[PDB]
Amino acid sequence: VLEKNATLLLIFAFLVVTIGGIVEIAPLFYLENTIEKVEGMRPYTPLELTGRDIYIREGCYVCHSQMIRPMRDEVERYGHYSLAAESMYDHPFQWGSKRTGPDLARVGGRYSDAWHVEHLSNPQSVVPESVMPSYSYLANVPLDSTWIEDRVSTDALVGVPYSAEMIAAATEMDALVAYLQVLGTMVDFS
Amino acid sequence: SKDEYFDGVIRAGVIATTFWGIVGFLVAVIIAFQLAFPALNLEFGNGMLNFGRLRPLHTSAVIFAFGGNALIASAFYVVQRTSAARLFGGTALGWFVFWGWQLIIVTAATSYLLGGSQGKEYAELNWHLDILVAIVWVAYLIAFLGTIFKRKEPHIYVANWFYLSFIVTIAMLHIVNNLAVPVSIFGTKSVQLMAGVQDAMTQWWYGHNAVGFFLTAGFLGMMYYFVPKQAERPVYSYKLSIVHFWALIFLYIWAGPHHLHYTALPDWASTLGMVMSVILWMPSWGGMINGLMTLSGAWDKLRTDPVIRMMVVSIGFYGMSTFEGPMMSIKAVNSLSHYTDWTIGHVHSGALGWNGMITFGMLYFLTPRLWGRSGLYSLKLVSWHFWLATIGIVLYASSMWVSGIMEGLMWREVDAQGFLVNGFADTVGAKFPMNVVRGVGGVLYLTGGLIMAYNLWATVAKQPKTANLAV
Amino acid sequence: TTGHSWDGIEELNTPLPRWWLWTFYATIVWGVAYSIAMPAATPGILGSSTRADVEKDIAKFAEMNKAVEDKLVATDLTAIAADPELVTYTRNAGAAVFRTWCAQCHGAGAGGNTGFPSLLDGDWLHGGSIETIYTNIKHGIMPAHLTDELLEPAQIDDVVQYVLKISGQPADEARATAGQQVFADNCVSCHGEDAKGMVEMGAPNLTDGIWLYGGDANTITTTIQLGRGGVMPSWSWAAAQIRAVASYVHSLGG
Ligand code: HEC
Ligand code: HEC
Ligand code: HEC
Ligand code: HEC
Ligand code: HEC
Ligand SMILES: [Cu+2]
């Protein structure tokens, strides 16, 4: 029965619901492949980290994927298919779910900073047909980097290898471009 | 005493359900239009309308605010009646859940456009909001489970199995996926506990199960109460209820990796997701069968009662999406479907067709009763609403399928020489008509929502003091 | 029907639908089969299957189209532009490759825009020869006179006006004398006298017709003030394809 018993039903539900989570999530913490960074890779530089946060704030993810699937055509279009090691540092992970715009994972030099500036400033200007929104404010706002130290410290706590030295050492458009320029670079050079 | 059901909270949640429905769907239409014509985005100045920011607002408002309020109103009404006792938290605990929830949505409205988002889908709100939601949800479970504990009848209706499960699992999912170290006060001024593949897994476990419990299970509870609520008597299958419920509740949690196909996530996990997503097909359909078969003999009612129409069609879309989902969960299919508008097609088929329609019908049924009214102000409007909503959903789905297939194909398509046939821009251009049609379909559905608002309002006007006697 | 009512609702004790049962069981069976077949096997892939299929996809593709690329590679770039077999397939596909990779900077037309060169036309900054174009593609890609004390606020204006005269004829007498003098001193070294320009440097000729580049006096003032600094990213990492593209770009003008 157990129809009648509130506690039993509750307990069984909690138990029934748990198995998939334990089975899928938990072992990942342990598996090395997903944990290991690409050997060459380093953590995001403070400007790039700030830019990544901007990329998050804006909602770039909502149109842009950062995960190259292992198919020939996407390899051809984007580059080497993404590797788990690349995303090891990413709190939170940027893999997309939608590609209104093209995949961003490996823009490890593909465009010049100047291009990125013009495009972000007005995508239509460079790419007339673009659906992408214009982000001119990025030029307007400067970064104080007050918070950057805190952010890196927190990431270190999270496991990112920032040096004490890195924290100490650390416009929005500049940051965004800086971030975009790093993407996927780690694998190619290594 | 307190023999009378506490209608209070259900009334508030119902009205707010309609309100948030309008707000969320309107944002949906607007952002869709933004995809069609980017001008709708502010060119200079981030401002008020920018797609990247608005999108999660649409998401949260539609799911948590609209769907959430629908769930609150429905669960509070349904559990009370199904168990025959007045709500356990009462105005105090339950109303707290109301205001608290309202605060949560309001905070989302302010915070998201402001730019504070974790970037995690369906997770987007900042940590402070996460704590608030955890608190409100905790209160909500105490009220609900307490209501069950206090029940009169020895057995607990299956609808409550679904609601109860939904409650618990969402709480667990929310807490786990939200672990994050706070860097600053808000926005995503927190970084997620996990990273990379692991973060992706936790995210999608959370993300699927969100629709799985929040959108499917909880709504299945709604279906279980409302569909059988009719003049016609018995036709159902209890044993199915049992099999379908447990199997769904168990199997669904495994479905997470279907999002992750052909990604960095390890092959084993992806496969487990695929296999279980396929097994998931059966229980999910068990829900639809249990709902529809109940109607058997009763079908003549469909022409007569539009509320019934809504519930039935709701199940039709539900089954359709619950079929399409398992298919897309196959790696080969996902190979095409992923990152295309098809995913969106799938989402709105379930969203407009299943979730929205059943909640709609649910409200049309309950709101008069809660309001101390025999029925809605105008049945005709419910019918018109039904049509508007149906054409809108179908149009939305069709456009997205065409767009999605076109995109996956165009992206993958290779020439004789082996070169890539289309530029991404070409695919983008191809998508435009799809964007416009989708904009229209969603617009029509939204208009239906407006008609609902008008009708409900008219009915709401009739009586102050609408205690509806004993009940 | 069962004995207990929940507010109105009662439930029939009915059997699970046979088809429903079958489908449920079938899915389960499929799942077990899938797991045995997948990671835990399937034939056709040695070891264990994985995303490894990628290698196979590329490999078969390579077998299928390796010859076309290999044939082209032996041929010189100039030859690969001329020949409609390789040469024509090189323009359409090279043109195919062009759209995917290059079109976003240099235009679908390859006509270009402000800040990016028009590949179609006759004029080449780095040099039009096949080797030059290839080099541009394979290995990828103006001094700030405003600061150099002498140039200043006025010197820049003068040089701008003079260059517009080299390009054509506007009327500003102060902006001309001074500018001629400055150009001969500094600019001429890279752009030459009479602005033929030097391909080696990628210094464009000042004696040009109306192009997409900011001809206006003000725009010239800005480039002279601040200097240029444009990049053509290297396709050697990202990109055989580079060769076909060089053949296509070459074919474009003529
Ligand atoms: C944006 C980052 C570009 C990418 C993508 C492509 N090109 Fe480019 N190219 C770009 C610029 C800004 C310039 C001018 C650089 C300068 O001197 O200031 C160029 C130049 C070339 C040239 C040389 C033209 C000449 O006058 O000699 C060639 C042959 C060329 N680009 C080819 C080319 C190809 C084939 C591309 C796709 C693989 C491509 N470019 C991409 C900017 C950008
Ligand atoms: C939804 C609409 C968006 C938003 C929210 C973002 N982008 Fe994009 N983006 C979009 C489209 C349709 C395109 C293709 C047309 C074009 O190139 O303009 C792009 C393109 C880019 C690119 C170039 C990618 C490439 O060609 O390799 C980049 C680098 C890019 N977008 C960046 C970017 C950033 C940083 C965003 C947040 C500010 C952003 N995009 C949002 C569509 C959309
Ligand atoms: C040495 C290197 C020099 C010096 C001494 C001068 N120029 Fe400039 N110039 C040079 C290059 C390599 C380029 C191309 C820049 C690029 O493509 O990014 C240029 C460009 C110009 C232009 C722009 C042409 C256009 O609009 O596309 C102008 C107007 C120009 N240079 C003028 C100019 C003047 C007036 C100079 C003396 C003050 C001068 N250059 C010096 C290389 C070099
Ligand atoms: C749950 C209820 C729900 C309702 C009701 C709803 N949506 Fe959405 N919408 C979603 C979800 C979930 C997503 C995110 C999809 C994703 O992330 O793949 C979304 C995303 C979107 C997007 C972004 C599409 C893209 O390609 O990025 C648009 C546009 C949209 N919805 C339009 C609409 C319109 C128009 C309506 C008209 C009624 C509507 N929505 C109603 C749930 C809903
Ligand atoms: C709202 C109703 C709804 C129902 C019912 C539903 N899903 Fe979905 N589906 C969604 C949403 C929302 C997303 C988008 C998630 C995202 O943003 O990536 C989605 C996307 C998917 C995708 C594509 C993921 C990707 O990125 O390629 C698959 C596969 C999927 N769901 C499987 C299923 C399965 C399996 C079921 C049931 C057996 C199911 N769906 C039922 C809402 C629903
Ligand atoms: Cu899912």
Residue numbers in the entry:
A (entry chain o): 9 to 178, 215 to 234
B (entry chain n): 57 to 527
C (entry chain p): 13 to 52, 60 to 160, 174 to 271, 281 to 295
Q: What did the article's authors report about this structure?
A:
CIII2 is a dimer with each monomer comprised of three subunits: the Rieske FeS (FeS) protein with a [2Fe-2S] cluster, cyt b with hemes bH and bL, and cyt c1 with heme c1 cofactors. The FeS protein external domain (FeS-ED) is mobile between the b (close to heme bL) and c (close to heme c1) positions. In R. capsulatus, both the diffusible cyt c2 and the membrane-anchored cyt cy carry electrons from CIII2 to CIV in respiration. Here we report the cryo-electron microscopic (cryo-EM) structure of this functional bc1-cbb3-type SC (CIII2CIV, at 5.2 Å resolution), together with three structural conformers of native CIII2 (at 3.3–4.2 Å resolution).
Focused classification and processing of the subclass containing ~62,000 particles with the highest initial resolution and best discernable features yielded a tripartite CIII2CIV map (SC-1A, EMD-22228) at 6.1 Å resolution (“Methods”), while another dataset produced a map (SC-1B, EMD-22230) at 7.2 Å resolution. Superimposition of the CIII2 portions of SC-1A and SC-1B maps showed that CIV was in different orientations in different maps. The two extreme locations of CIV with respect to CIII2 were displaced from each other by a translation of ~3 Å and a rotation of ~37° (SC-1A in red and SC-1B in blue). Other subclasses identified in 3D classifications showed CIV in various orientations between those seen in SC-1A and SC-1B maps. This CIII2CIV interface flexibility is attributed to the limited interaction between the CcoP (N-ter transmembrane helix (TMH)) of CIV and the cyt b (TMH7) of CIII2 (top view). In the interface regions of SC-1A and SC-1B maps, additional weaker features that are not readily attributable to CIII2 and CIV structures were observed. However, no membrane-external feature that might correspond to cyt domain of cy, which is an integral part of the cyt c1-CcoP-cy subunit, could be discerned in these maps.
